[PDB]
Symmetry: D3
């Protein structure tokens, strides 16, 4: 297939304009190693230029979505660590959150802290009732890494954010949905199907418009109303120009 | 009556200190034309100085609240367009959001993107279970206009905001309420009544205080705690001075 | 006991690493007088250095949590008033909100505006179904004082925030929970018990980590994603250093 | 003339694309009254749509630019929320991000409230002879409207706070040292230097010049990382508006 | 005297409304120790409520302003969260938005941590002879507390970063070029120039001067559009607090 | 040599810890093309991990620093989202908060897009002879990428807007007046002055210097009250990374 064999820790399947992306260390519950961070940068930069990819789905192999950063690795370690950090950032949110194409997280199982940044950076998100979530950094004796805290701060109310961050307790899919972490939670049985219907629906939209709408909305969150009058019109006009 | 005949696209009725404002193009589902934007600036500046107006209700004629910006008009078109944009801003949020008197949106039917700015800029909002809402800019092939995105970003969680913005799907009143877009949703039958009870309740309050409370709260959202200690006390003291 | 007799308006009990703090003017429904503000600064600075205190609970004597600022006192009054204001700030949020140790509000009864700042500045919060809440500043003819508005703006959606601020209406514990003001609401009967279980659970955590996690999360709310990559890593590294 | 007789407190002479706008209450040192505020809103809004108007220059009749807001009026409610708003509407809400280039030509006394539209103008030329101060403090009031912020955005905080705190005056040469103006030239050559520059700005594609100047001013409020998005959005917006 | 003997590391002479506040460990070049921090909090809090105190001047005993934080102490936990907080409490949390005007009178060496309360003061006068540097870098540590931000807010980033990165020193004349002070005058006339100015600030309505200076400093953090609300709120607040 | 032949548009000579980095299309006045962008990303990323590299200097081959972005290319979509991103990636995303000290050594013409990596460098030395302008306006486009913001962060808004609006050029002496560089010295002594300073920066603990310079730059975006948390977090972070 188009990309079969291109990466060791990640696989990509194109189907009807959908680039399904699977994180591919099922035996390590798809933990995010530096290898996998470097490959995921490449996968995103590659799919950005591939005109057969209209929408991405992010998912994980086996029963993990991801189980967070690769533990048995941080233990290892240092100007190198600077660049290891940047390459986690590069794919998890620097590219993904304001991606030029629509993104959806399809959360099939374990999502554990670290995995929350790229979850939140996806435009939308469906999970399984049977998925299981955790900000268990605290039990391993660290505070959430990367933009995990910020992912939560934009998404979950602080009463609920701080409980889960400070206690380390797990929560099920239904609960991720109550808290507004995902758009919805459906039986695993119906997950891939439901995600796909949505994926197809977004392919129906003018993709230069959808970009400006979705990526303009995200940035407008950080600006004042009076600043946004100017920003969001500049993005409306930009959209007009890049379409014709 | 006091203001009967003063505007072509908007009507105003005073009753017990309540300025009921009706957008008045029912045959165009109260779309917001430049004419109607210019008149609504005037209506707000006029009602600001009218001491018989203690609280405003914003509502629309017939079965529309508003159906958003006037389509068959944007198609038309350009230094003019600059000023057409400003005059939409002037009434929809520049005057309305930090209005000197309490404001309530009474959403009786269709509310479609564009109509969301002045909906959110109103201090409070009641809708009918039977009203119907949409950010269908995307199906017409544009991103939300004016401060629509920002209206949503301050009001609805991003999972839900982006679904509705990116898909274009409609939602009913009950759902606007779940998402915190309105204070509540009641049968159309009871709407005008329920709105009025609330309107009367706000008339009971010292209006220089209510201003400082409501308009100070809105602005405090953009400031840090440490900045707000100084801002909100300056607004408390201001309130004291402008009252006696 | 360790601190018996140290303050006139506040009492402190240590038990299993928990500093239970009781506001202690039950006959004035624990209103917050300048005396009580000065003592609460001292109580927080004192408990910060006491290594037998791992977590704080904030609660009030009798049937009040607090009934807000001391009315019969503001009536009294002025460069003095400057310093009276600062000392309310000092304990209610300047020290409490980014406190070095975990904090929990245990809301046993009346909480009325003013009491909302230190409620929200606590990391977490449990209330009784039978507690009763109000932003009734408006009926007394003032806008919320201190950081009350801001407390609400960070916690409750604006539809709901502004209703309660502008109307002055009361709400019960169950409702504080719906609005995300508290983590949960339980019968008064089970309150002290439920709070304690949680308090013990947080004592199990590395306290230099918990600090950086909880106090880093709060501050990340005010920063952009790109700013937070640098901030939250600096806080991760800080945490590493202050632990060993 | 086009505009001759249209405004009681303001006078507007079009000449070679330039729109010379003269504050016209010299009997009051052009003090900024509620009347002069409303008219100025109109003037700006009229000149925005006048295609014979490429640049604006703002200057004062006589030996006065303006001596600030009208003290006689100050003296005394909801009506005050409007008069403030009208002061703002022209002195910076419209002026600072105006659709066309703007220059302040400061011929004489510029005190207090006058600093806002001074700063709000894209560029500014004064006279060696012109004299400024922030006298609000001597009148027993703190700088009003956006004056403080005008100062904060352009003058170093040590110098800013000397003049706000003492209310001492300064002349055109000091104005230039501080960064409050582009240059200070003898009153003699002031109209000439302003005209030269105004002519230069007319050479430029008007839509581009808009994006350039109005994008730069906003870009101060934004971080680099936010600005990558904003300024590129203004680039494309600029391209879209050309024909 | 009123305050004579009240503080071990600080000395406070009231004279004609002026409150001369002297950092008083000249044997240590007035190095800012945890003791001197706690006392300074008290001093500021005491002088806030003293109605005979209209202005403050902050200066150092001997030939030293301060040579920064106390290196002997630095050397070594939760207690560190307090000592930092106390350093902050006086050097800017209270000082920078102090209820009364504040002037730094810089008589001698001013290094490192000393720059925060330098900047935090509304105004500042130094001596030609006084010498400054940001030597933290030579000690193998980056500027501490709010030092960086002191520099960011007042000195251009090229100059700011030369001195933070190299740790080179500079004298009073350079200080003034950069905008770090209001002026640099021979040590001879330093006490005189400071007194003159201090006297001028006493002429002013105290409540108004507060609103004016403390509003200006905050207005830097805000946009124009936000500032319309903030500064008018400080205007009215100012009016309300007068009698 | 280590890097000799590794890059087609850029040349990198290591000498005594210093990493002289030369933009190397002198036939095009080192115009910044998509090729030179990609290579520059690589160069920076390579030099970050090279332990023989302590400082960087960025300079241009011939009598040109760079004359900005490559106009021949500009001319013509999703691919444009990448080429912009690559321009950004090196000119400020990596450079401005680079792990090692950075100096711009400006030997010749510096126009337009070149101002971003100019500003983004921690420090900068130019030649009396070198010539700059913001000519985008004459080309019928507004400053691109982060140029505006480069200017907003370092040059006073009056001067910033003169040069953005008119597109007039200026020489090395003006550059220094405005705060765009640290100094302007005869081309003759330029390499010497740059080397001296570069040598000085190598004296410093590298990890500390990082925290110091990169903390200072970020601290501009933050308020004092936020900065108390941020900068102390960078202090401790700095201590943690030393051995
Ligand atoms: C996800 C989880 C529940 C899986 O449970 P499970 O189905 O029983 O699978 P196991 O726990 O047996 O782990 C299976 C393998 O995955 C590995 N693994 C799981 N999470 C991992 C991580 N974050 N890093 C590295 N390896 C991981 C285990 O080491 C184990 O390796 P091995 O059996 O090949 O030696 C569990 O691994 C877990 O709780 N991880 C928590 C991660 C976390 O919170 N990290 C901090 C976030 S940044
Ligand atoms: C509101 C709506 C559902 C009404 O349905 P309806 O009750 O069947 O009424 P119709 O759709 O028949 O439209 C009735 C009239 O209203 C007009 N109208 C409705 N919305 C309008 C708009 N935004 N601008 C201009 N005219 C509009 C139609 O042109 C039609 O005109 P005509 O019959 O006089 O020729 C439908 O008009 C609509 O979906 N509009 C969407 C607007 C939108 O999303 N705009 C972008 C937002 S800024
Ligand atoms: C809390 C409350 C419901 C208690 O009701 P209750 O159980 O009947 O008790 P009472 O109302 O009889 O008040 C009991 C005593 O508490 C005092 N008290 C209550 N709230 C107080 C306050 N905020 N300040 C000072 N005293 C207060 C009353 O003066 C009364 O004093 P006294 O009986 O010793 O003369 C009622 O006191 C109240 O509504 N306070 C509102 C406070 C408020 O909204 N303040 C603005 C917030 S900053
Ligand atoms: C500008 C100034 C130096 C002019 O010098 P001058 O030649 O002496 O002229 P005068 O002001 O003495 O007199 C001319 C007229 O201008 C009027 N005027 C001047 N400034 C004014 C102001 N700010 N508001 C209202 N009227 C003003 C005077 O009332 C006087 O009118 P009158 O003759 O009807 O009484 C001096 O008027 C001045 O500084 N005034 C303003 C003080 C100020 O800065 N206020 C700040 C508040 S924002
Ligand atoms: C200010 C300075 C030039 C004074 O010149 P000097 O006349 O040579 O005086 P010296 O410092 O040599 O000696 C005077 C005393 O002041 C003390 N001192 C000076 N600066 C100090 C500081 N920052 N912390 C603690 N003690 C200090 C010395 O330890 C010495 O005490 P001792 O005599 O008990 O050993 C020089 O002391 C200096 O630069 N010191 C501080 C270095 C610095 O800037 N540190 C920055 C960290 S924020
Ligand atoms: C820098 C400058 C003064 C050099 O003076 P010069 O000695 O006359 O050199 P010239 O530019 O005339 O010619 C040298 C070559 O450099 C090329 N060049 C110069 N600037 C360039 C740019 N910005 N983009 C692409 N190519 C450029 C020319 O096309 C020419 O190539 P050619 O000989 O293959 O046609 C002048 O080239 C200049 O200002 N150019 C750029 C204009 C600009 O600032 N654009 C801003 C857009 S960001």
């Amino acid at each position: 297939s188009k990309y079969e064999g291109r990466w060791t820790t990640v696989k990509v399947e194109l189907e009807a304009g959908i680039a399904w992306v699977t994180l591919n260390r099922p035996e390590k519950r798809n933990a995010m190693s530096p290898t996998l961070n470097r490959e995921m940068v490449d996968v995103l930069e590659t799919l950005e230029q591939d005109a057969d990819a209209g929408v991405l789905v992010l998912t994980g192999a086996g029963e993990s979505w991801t189980a967070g950063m690769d533990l048995k690795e941080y233990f290892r370690e240092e100007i190198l660590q600077e660049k290891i950090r940047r390459e986690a950032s590069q794919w998890q949110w620097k590219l993904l959150r304001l991606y030029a194409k629509p993104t959806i997280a399809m959360v099939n199982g374990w999502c554990f802290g670290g995995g929350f940044s790229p979850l939140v950076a996806c435009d939308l998100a469906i999970c399984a009732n049977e998925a299981t979530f955790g900000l268990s950094e605290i039990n391993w004796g660290i505070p959430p890494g990367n933009l995990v805290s910020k992912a939560m701060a934009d998404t979950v109310g602080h009463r609920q954010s701080l409980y889960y961050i400070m206690t380390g307790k797990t929560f099920d899919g239904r609960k991720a949905a109550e808290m507004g972490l995902v758009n919805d939670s459906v039986p695993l049985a119906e997950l891939r199907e439901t995600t796909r219907e949505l994926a197809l629906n977004l392919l129906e939209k003018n993709p230069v418009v959808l970009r400006a709408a979705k990526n303009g909305f995200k940035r407008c969150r950080e600006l004042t109303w009076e600043q946004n009058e100017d920003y969001l019109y500049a993005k409306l006009d930009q959209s007009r120009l890049l379409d014709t």
